[model samples]
Target: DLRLHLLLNTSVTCNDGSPAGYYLKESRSRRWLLFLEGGWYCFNRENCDSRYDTMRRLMSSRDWPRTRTGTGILSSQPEENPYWWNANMVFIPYCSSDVWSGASSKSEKNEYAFMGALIIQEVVRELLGRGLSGAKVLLLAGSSAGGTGVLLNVDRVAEQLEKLGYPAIQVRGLADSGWFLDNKQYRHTDCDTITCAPTEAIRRGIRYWNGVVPERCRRQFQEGEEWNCFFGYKVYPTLRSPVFVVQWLFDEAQLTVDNVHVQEGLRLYIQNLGRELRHTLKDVPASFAPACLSHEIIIRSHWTDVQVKGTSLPRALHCWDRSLHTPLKGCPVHLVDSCPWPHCNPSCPT
Candidate 1:
């Protein structure tokens, strides 16, 4: 509900971190949480509570920003952000792999993992409270399996957001829709049928080629051999972050094989993710790569309005997710122009 439409311009603290100053009658501050653990909830119970009164009328009234709907060079940018709040987004649900992946049940942990460990020990506990010693992080998006489990676990999630005093941790983007990028270490050959993994065509730093090429000791798998053996080799040169790729340049269900048709070997995965954002890497040299778009049109067009279906193609974009009324593009895996660059037929993984 990131402030639904947005407007208030002020009050920001519900994800834990509240008020109780000299005005502390009972002081709890307010980051109220619940689980009701599925079957639909906010924490259901006491007949009179019917899922905590539908979460007391959906958070009764915090009336965040949510207000701007029309007139402008382009509107709709208030999905909550009265300016500064934390717990730096953990939203991992799909696989049920707690670190917040749907908190699988320690009673299915609440307060969103206790405000994610109170946002990691209150990030420098405000040194003297109130805040502003160091603060960074505007976005760190993830999709397609939490974009391969948060960039293979962002260094234990940036050491739990640096125990609070979070500093300059900007990762403005890391887009992913079917973005598994890498993980190909299987050469059993007894009689299988497929294997050859490690991808990051959405470029920019930090990697390690699994201790010097493990793709069966490459004879000529050149180009960062064995695709820089997943996370930590070049690891986008140790990412400070910013990759934002709608990727899947024909990712036909994970890089097609037999006769190879996934956009015919994505030219060395788009020249190693457009290789340029350097200091060694962790990309975002401001690239657009719109030659053709669709990684679910950059992730359900990231809440642009949250609808789905064929997604009004013009080269469709995708959006709408009022927490899932359902439409954020359907099964065809966010489809794009069937294909037409140098050539793209085999009709993708659609």
Candidate 2:
């Protein structure tokens, strides 16, 4: 079991003022796998208030369990999670709801803490005393919003560890189902709901949360356009550390936000989405893009079953791990499914 460890010494707190924490499973190996939990965020006070009333677990740590079990990438079982299973596994709970980007604490005006970014920093500091200081590699992985968090914070974590006196550790990222594209929606509508107004929602959210972004990415955008970095395609170019993206060709979450529906009429539009995803990811050094309508993958029990171009995600990850240590000798890590339609892979979960 992954035992819970509250950050009692840090100033980081959840939206509801409870202590931010993570569930940890210790290992003797000098490798680490830290997975950030994903939960949809609230862009404004009204949205946050509504979330607090309805989905309090996402906003508060009051009812959190004492221990949590690992699965998929976080799984302790070797058969379920082949590579890096013996590494120190950490499962961080998401309570800030800022897409793990916020840096500000609770204030009189804001009514809640948005310390998602700071939570990662403090957690690393705590882990340093718990054997992370001697780690040889650190793979920061997450699914959905948490996967976006990996992209947003991976470089920062590497830099922080270097500054905190560990420069030899190899810090890499595995972002599962976080590569979101800010493409045009199939249908146009007023920017009212968050689902329909992603740009507007993020623009408002940054200010409300005092969001922190990658330094290079922030420099590329103007004063108000810092929100652009929130998109995977927009921010990927600025990341210095090595990152492997795991995204579905037809992401359900992206479709919902874009107001897209899967029908015979929208087949071309859906196909174009896959095409765009493939085109945008062409320059990425490593990724796994399977043509499916799913969202997150790495956290599922069948994570090892999904394949792209005959290479399963776990197999690709193993190749990625080896390539990092030695020169790649034809091991294909950038495995993207060539199928033009969704659910083309036979191994896809029903």
Candidate 3:
């Protein structure tokens, strides 16, 4: 079972001034899987106020349960999560409403705290005493917004671990459904929704949340354009740690932001998404892009079912793990669905 552990540091908190926390399932193995919980973010004060009013749980930990169970990549069952079943498992709750990139605490300017980056750092620091000090491998994984969190903070985690005197602990990233494109929307409209407000929203949010980005990626952009690092395509190239990307050919979230409904006669639009995703991930050494219309996958019970070119996600991940140990013996880690259409694979969930 995953038991709750609130952060000892009170400065790091959720959006509604509630304490931030995480859940952990310990094991004898030295490997660790830290999964960041995912939820959409609020870019501005008005958006955050609405989020707190509607999605209270996402913004505040006041009602979080004491204990929870792991699923998908966090699963303990070998059948469900074959590769890292026996490893130390951790589940971090999302409440910052900053996509896990904020560094500022609550201030008069903002009614709530946005310390997502600090929370992750604090969690790792706390875990050091809880066997993470001896960890051999740490797979920083997340889905959707959490997946983007992994991209934004994976290298920072690695660096922090190293500075804390655990440089030997290898940190890797597994981002599911977090590889979002910053392309144009299918229909141009006012920035009414978060999905529709891409660059402009982020550009504004970076200042509001005091957002933090990867150091390397931050240096490449201008002062205001630091928001570019939030996108996988922009930040992936600057990451020092190896990362495995999992994305769908027809991502529901992406399509929603693009205003391309699946049944609204947007066949060409859907195909273009697939094509762009394929092109973006073409150079990535470790990725699993399947022709599916789902959002997140790593946490699903059927995570093992989705396939690309006869290779399931789990199988590809196993190959990736093996390649890390034995680089000489190559493995097929880059598995992308050749089909251009959504749900082209029979194994995809109905």
- Write model 2 residue lDDT over 192-222, tens digit each, in one string: 4444467888888899899998989999996
Q: Which whole-number lDDT from 0 to 100 does residue 250 have in model 2?
A: 85
List, residue by residue over 1-350, the lDDT tens digit for candidate 3: 89999888877898877889999999979999989889888877777888888899898889999999888878899999877889999999999988899988877777888888998999999999999999999999999989999999999999998887888999999998888888867788765554446777778778889999999998999688898998999899999999999888788888887876646447777788899999999899899988888775688876787767777888888999888883434457998888888778887778
The prediction achieving the highest TM-score against the true structure is 2
Clashing pairs in 3: none
Better of 1 and 2 by lDDT: 2
Task: Put down candidate 1 lDDT per residue, 160-266, tens digits, no spaces.
Answer: 44565464443243444424334332122221113322232211111210122222223334555533423322443344443433444433333342123435445
Q: Once superposed on the true structure, which residue ranges of model 2 sit more than 4 Å away at CA?
A: 262-265, 326-330
Ten contiguous residues minimizing lDDT sum, candidate 3: 323-332
Per-residue lDDT value at 202 in model 3? 79
User: Comparing 2 and 3 by TM-score, which wins?
Assistant: 2
Alpha-carbon RMSD to native, per candidate: 20.6, 1.5, 1.8
Off by over 4 Å in 3: 192-196, 262-265, 326-331
TM-score of 3: 0.96
**Global lDDT scores for all candidate models:** 0.28, 0.86, 0.87
Root-mean-square deviation of candidate 2: 1.5
